Amino acid sequence: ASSERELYEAWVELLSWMREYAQAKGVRFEKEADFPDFIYRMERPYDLPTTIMTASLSDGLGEPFLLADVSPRHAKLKRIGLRLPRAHIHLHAHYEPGKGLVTGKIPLTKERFFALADRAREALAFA
Amino acid sequence: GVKEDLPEEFVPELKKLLEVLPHRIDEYEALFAESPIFYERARGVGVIPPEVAIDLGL
Amino acid sequence: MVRVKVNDRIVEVPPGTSVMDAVFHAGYDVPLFCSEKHLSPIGACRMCLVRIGLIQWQPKLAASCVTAVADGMVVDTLSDVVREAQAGMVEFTLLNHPLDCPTCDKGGACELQDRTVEYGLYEKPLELPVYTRFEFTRRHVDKHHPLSPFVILDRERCIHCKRCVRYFEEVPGDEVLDFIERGVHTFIGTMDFGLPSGFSGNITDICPVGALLDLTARFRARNWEMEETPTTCALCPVGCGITADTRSGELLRIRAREVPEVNEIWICDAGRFGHEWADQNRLKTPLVRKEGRLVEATWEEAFLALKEGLKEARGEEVGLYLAHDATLEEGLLASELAKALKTPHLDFQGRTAAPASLFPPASLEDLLQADFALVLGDPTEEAPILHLRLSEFVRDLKPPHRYNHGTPFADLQIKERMPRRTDKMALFAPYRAPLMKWAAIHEVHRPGEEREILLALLGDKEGSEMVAKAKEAWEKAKNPVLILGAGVLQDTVAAERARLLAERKGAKVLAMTPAANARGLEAMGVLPGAKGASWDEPGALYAYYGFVPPEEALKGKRFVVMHLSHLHPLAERYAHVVLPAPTFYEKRGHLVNLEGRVLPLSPAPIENGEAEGALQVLALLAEALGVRPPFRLHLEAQKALKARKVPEAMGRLSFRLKELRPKERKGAFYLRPTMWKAHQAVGKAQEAARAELWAHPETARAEALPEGAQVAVETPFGRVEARVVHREDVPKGHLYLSALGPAAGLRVEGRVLV
Amino acid sequence: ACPAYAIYVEPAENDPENPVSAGERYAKVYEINMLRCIFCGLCEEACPTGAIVLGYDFEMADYEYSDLVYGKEDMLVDVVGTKPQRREAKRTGKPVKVGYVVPYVRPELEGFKAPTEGGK
Amino acid sequence: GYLHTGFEKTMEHRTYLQNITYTPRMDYLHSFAHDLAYALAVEKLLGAVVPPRAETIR
Amino acid sequence: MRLERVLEEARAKGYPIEDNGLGNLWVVLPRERFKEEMAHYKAMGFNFLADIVGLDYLTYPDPRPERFAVVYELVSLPGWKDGDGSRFFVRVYVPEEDPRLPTVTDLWGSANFLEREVYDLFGIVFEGHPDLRKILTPEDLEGHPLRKDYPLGETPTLFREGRYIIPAEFRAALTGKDPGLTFYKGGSRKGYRSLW
Amino acid sequence: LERLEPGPVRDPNPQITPPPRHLLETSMEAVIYHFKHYTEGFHPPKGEVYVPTESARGELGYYIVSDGGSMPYRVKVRAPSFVNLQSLPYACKGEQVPDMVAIIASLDPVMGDVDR
Amino acid sequence: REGILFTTLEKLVAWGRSNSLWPATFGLACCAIEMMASTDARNDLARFGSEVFRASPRQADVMIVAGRLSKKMAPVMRRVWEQMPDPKWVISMGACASSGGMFNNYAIVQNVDSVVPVDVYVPGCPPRPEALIYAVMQLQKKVRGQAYNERGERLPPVAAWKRTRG
């Protein structure tokens, strides 16, 4: 319901992290997508806390090692997903009220995400 | 069908002008039927048989 | 033939054929996505599912296309159930198809889009529409991934067009892609990271979405807006039909034009991307040497100059030396002129020691009916896509049935992922080739040895095992086609020996030349005079130049008139008049295709400023010389062409011109037959078309060379920087240097400049 | 949509760091020849960005052909008048007016505030 | 016949939608009638129907 | 209904009878027999000859017997003291070689000008017609203009820095003959209709 | 006015009608059809058609042959006033000279009919 | 000899000329019907020196080329233009005239400015009457010389020295 909001707020959060890691390691970031519902929004209420629907971390070859996508506004089954290229690792962030934002059921933290990132970055290291 | 809905504003004004017009129409008519000069300019002229109206296409 | 009834109409159509094609012949249609022209089907799209009676009705809707035909068959396509299903599959397809239409640049060419709207629509007269049943979030995956210096990849475009992956197998038989993860998690990728195949770019056209696009024209124009100008290629001697997509009188994009004579649906990469020089700074106002510098002049000012230049000239002092980029018309006019006013020679830039008028040409379609191909040369470089035509030959395919639409869209005769032969061809290159992938008979020869091979096949020298097996094979090959290089045509003896063998068992020849329209110009007698000289050599003291010649050419002259399209270092201390010349795109005239076929070249609609063809300019030199050539226009030239006895619209022409003027020297530097030409090295292809220097690891070592770097080299054909290639297929004792521009097969002298 | 073909549009792909429009494509050149503009309105209907929204302008007229092919920056929601109006208002130093009023804005416009019964 | 365009020609070189531009551009008076008449023709052809309210407005 | 005594006759004379499901009907005649046939109709109580549309079928994506075809629309005005509302077309395919055809000035003085137009726009000389002149077009432009063959006459539109549009390839528009970017079409894009 | 109440204002078959623009936001299929509609525009089937109508100016009608392209293969316009003008030398037989002006005017010329 | 070349005269006479504008409309289009509108009934023109609104160049020198035109009209218009007195101004009214709106055709004449020189364009087909007012206000101050172009460039106070006057 309003789950939505905290999720969005979480999505920003996560994104923020993605940038941080990006700068931290100096690794390449690229915003991928923006909301359809921003484009074709044109007088109908927009209030999303960012404009960004999809964004990714790339190796420095334009090849991502990590993709990060939010669900759109009215697009049901609202979750945020991650997936590591060539790994078949598909992560489904739910939000759980009374907890926070959970990875399956385990609460996400930044470090979790960093660990995922480093193992990605270093392992797959396509370039 | 048309591409969007009517204005609401359309309704007042539409009534309004229907009120005024009957009277107005009359007053234009009023200029013509009398004015015996109106007669003397118009009546005789503009002739053509109905039959020929179709033949030549009217 | 097979008795088909598709719904309400019957057709004969011989057996082994796809239902699909008869459908389209019948004027009935279906949505179609997987299978395609010139390619073996798969079932994957599943769009060609119909029901059929023969009279009952199948319990499962077979992909008609995949299935063969049957006599007395009924095909049902107007089925209510079909239409419903079509929509169905459409919806299914659309499930993750990311919304991107306005910025989609598949766009007008989004055939997918068009099928959607054709065949789609909800099952319900409606009083309220429906659009979906879907509503969940889509997949988000990969985009903005540059796949190549020419090609951008945004992955979620793909419909799982399997076409390209398929292409790579079918057409080049060289693979570089693959599906990756399974199920829905899947997606196609490369692990080449930039695909080093010589044919690649066709996939842009094949991509039935906009995943693979020409970045160079990304966000530059829109599909519909372009004028798609069918015209002719000339950039390789195949000179394929092409289509110049243009807006603002500027070349947006080259796409294939699908003549099934000189390609089918196939283009070289060099052809498609190697066009930016045209899109770039080019000569567009006449120049003259002042006293120290070049001066912006008119045509008139030049004509005055021409008279001046021809006031102390006898016309035997004058050299006419053309590019290998001249039309029949310009040829014809040169011919007639050099008659009229004798000059000591006519030549053209790419011209060789022994013509292709020493041999038959052949057809590509001829080459499918063939037995064996004995190959000496390099299809990949010289005649690129012929390489591919051979691949098909080799993969065993017999000529396509062409009907009331030409090509069908399924190969049942051949079926993908399946063998090829090696022993159906013989190969001679002086080094490495991709052909060796399919070759077992392959041989790296020394440069000058080619003749000897020939000699040995005739049996007056002793071959190798390969050459022996070859000997045998040529016997056993009842109608083989002999394929001849640059190293062949430029070396008299080799040519002679070939000439013998190919006569002995009479048989057609495919003559790959570094000249483009070598054969037309040959026919137009643009060959040395009896006293003569070559295009490379000086033979005059004044000159007309359709091209930038050899350095040694420039010395031996004192008035030089160049009709060029750009400036080059060779000119600003050797020029006396430079003039603007039109692109081959925007040139007008007729060319003699390597097949033997005459083709017209459309003028392209492009900006050019001033650039009034060599036709006019050559005419005007003659005007400056007191000689009216009987024509100076296209129109009269067509007449005059026809007069020379050529029937327009792809005549086959025949003539045997025997001149066997020797001219070889033995160098230690090679002119390697290359796939690129100097002026192409601009744009993003700047690097792609830079020079390479190949040498045996041994000689590399011995000269203490860095084998990653680029090295300065000085040749009498210019100073090149060249990446250093180790390659033991090059025997030491020669340096193979990638010859940008025409000219190959030569042993040439230069120096490893330091 | 423009039957007059009244639009010369050079496209471009936005800056990734500094995108002039959030999109990946924008209009690097946006020209309109008002000398034949159809002001289709269908124009508006096709545009999906709702970029194009008819104004309330009509105070346009000048002496020179090629001045009347209004540019991008003249075609914004950020200008304060018509080209001649504005050009006058600098040389004269006078301010602006446009002499129209509506009952209220059109919802479609949602930037610029026009005189509306409460301005002129 | 000192004026003329050849609308009839031109409109074969524009879309159906586009043609609706042309229809009131040859009747200074009742513009909408031309338009309607053309509309109807098309509507008939592909068999499309029009809402009652639409028809009211029309 | 006035129509019907024509219809049985038409059928009797074997003339093909076109019909659109929109209830529009043509009668395909030869040139020769037309005049008299049509004479008989007016006699049979056909009030009003509304139209003459000259047709150029230079290029069509189906075969037709002739390139030039005329079509009359005859009507019976029921609001008149005679008539039944009986409205129908007559189509008459026309040799390109002879752009002749006897007038119907003879039965309506409307015709006069209508046929004049048709001389201008398509090449047809209607036999027995007083005056051919253009009544609608220059006589300094020739070639019986408004034909498919006949030029379309475009000019590039101009924008800053001379940047121009050429109309005739700008268009994403098409004809049925035309294929566009697509290699084929079917479905909707081969037309569509409804019944529901 | 009596017969007026809420209702959709155009045909809701989105195949043949451009869709509402408040839904591009939503489905792809929308987007597709929308895009398509305003670019290419539909293909009506092959046919000729005519409808007679009463204009203010008289008998109005369009004889439209479409070949099933995106543009018609014939647009004939029935222009009443033009036909009505044929009857002018007739109408103006033996008339008086100041009167002749009015006699033209009274018939109503809209030159568009005529000129086309 | 036209009221110039002393400080006084030129301003005087120019005020005279500017304020007395007598429109001769050259209807052949929809423009006319809007033009009669443009005259009366909401706004006036009599306060801009106009009782002349009618067909004599023998009454006017303000040429309003109002509407889309054909080939047949070019010499006609030319001649009509010629049969005006020596100072004379050319308004090119509306899109239909000015560059030929939405027609590209042999029949039509596109870019009316071809036939005769112009000084004022006023786009829009239809435009608003009021735009025309704005235009003549322009034209007022234009012939007053208190005008430029959009590049600050000055211009003559007449239309009639851009091509030959007579």
Ligand code: SF4
């Ligand atoms: S691939 Fe086709 S359907 Fe998809 S966004 Fe591109 S043009 Fe649209």
Ligand code: SF4
């Ligand atoms: S990239 Fe294109 S051609 Fe290749 S499989 Fe995908 S949809 Fe088919």
Ligand code: SF4
């Ligand atoms: S194969 Fe030759 S002819 Fe064909 S596109 Fe390539 S260079 Fe041009």
Ligand code: SF4
């Ligand atoms: S610009 Fe418009 S109002 Fe003026 S003549 Fe042209 S179509 Fe008519």
Ligand code: FES
């Ligand atoms: S299943 Fe795709 S074309 Fe046959």
